[PDB]
RNA sequence: CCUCUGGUGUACCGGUUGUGACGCCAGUCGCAUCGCCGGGUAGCUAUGUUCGGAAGGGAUAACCGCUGAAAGCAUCUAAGC
């Protein structure tokens, strides 16, 4: 596996520790923990990191590749972090943030109140845009997915919640 | 379930035909589908009255995902959620 063979770099300030199988990643953003498969072994030499199979099985190579990908994502997130960005399209559609809660109007008979999970923060420079930032890429993706599922876009006029870099199929009636 | 609206209510009250009897008048009783007719207490009852199928958890079906390699890309799946 090219991924599993490629190593990852610990930039300056993040410490990665291990006990049993539970790898832990520490930095400015916060703690991030990742369990490890039985067929995968981890070698920490200098600032670089190396995942390697414990046997020659293709399954072991697969587990090594996914473990390296997830650990690289964690190392990148704990130092820099990720943000997603969300756009709203349609008249009367609006968003606001009151601390940990997002208040949304999407053309229903009642406004929607979404609680944000711990670790994800949101900002609203404008009623049309939302910015979501977190250190956990999976959590950020899940929260963005739920917000989009509240009103997914439609193809005739493109109204609804959309990702920033999302291509939306457009058609024309009759 | 029987407070209300009704039905039934042959041991409750009354009107009335024929006949026989209680010595006779008066007053009563037997029999005639409870003789026939008009009402009707409890109980039972519907066509009457009240109530019920409310709300909430947990695991899922089709389906929709997050992150993610095998397969440097992509991918809901193989680890995980």
From Swiss-Prot:
UniProt KW Repressor keyword: no
Cellular component GO terms, alphabetical: cytosolic large ribosomal subunit
Alphabetical list of Gene3D superfamilies matching this protein: Ribosomal protein L6, alpha-beta domain
Tree of life domain: Bacteria
Keyword Cell division set for record: no
Pfam families: Ribosomal_L6
Transmembrane segments: none
NCBIfam families: L6_bact
Binding partners and assembly: Part of the 50S ribosomal subunit.
Name of the protein in its database record: Large ribosomal subunit protein uL6
Organism annotation: Acinetobacter baumannii (strain AB0057)
Gene: rplF
């Amino acid at each position: 596996s090219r991924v599993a063979k490629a190593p990852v770099t610990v930039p300056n300030g993040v410490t990665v520790t291990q006990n049993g199988r539970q790898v832990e990643v520490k930095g400015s953003k916060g703690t991030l923990s990742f369990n490890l498969h039985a067929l995968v072994e981890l070698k920490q030499e200098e600032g670089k990191l190396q995942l390697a199979p414990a046997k020659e099985s293709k399954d072991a190579w697969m587990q090594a590749g996914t473990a390296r990908a997830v650990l690289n994502n964690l190392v990148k997130g704990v130092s820099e972090g990720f943000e997603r960005k969300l756009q709203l399209v349609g008249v009367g559609y609006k968003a606001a943030v009151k601390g940990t809660v997002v208040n949304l109007n999407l053309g229903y008979s009642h406004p929607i109140d979404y609680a944000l999970p711990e670790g994800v923060t949101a900002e609203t420079p404008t009623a049309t845009e939302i910015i979501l930032k977190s250190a956990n890429k999976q959590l950020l993706g899940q929260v963005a997915a739920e917000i989009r599922a509240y009103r997914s876009p439609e193809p005739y006029k493109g109204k609804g919640v959309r990702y920033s870099d999302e291509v939306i199929l457009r058609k024309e009636a009759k």
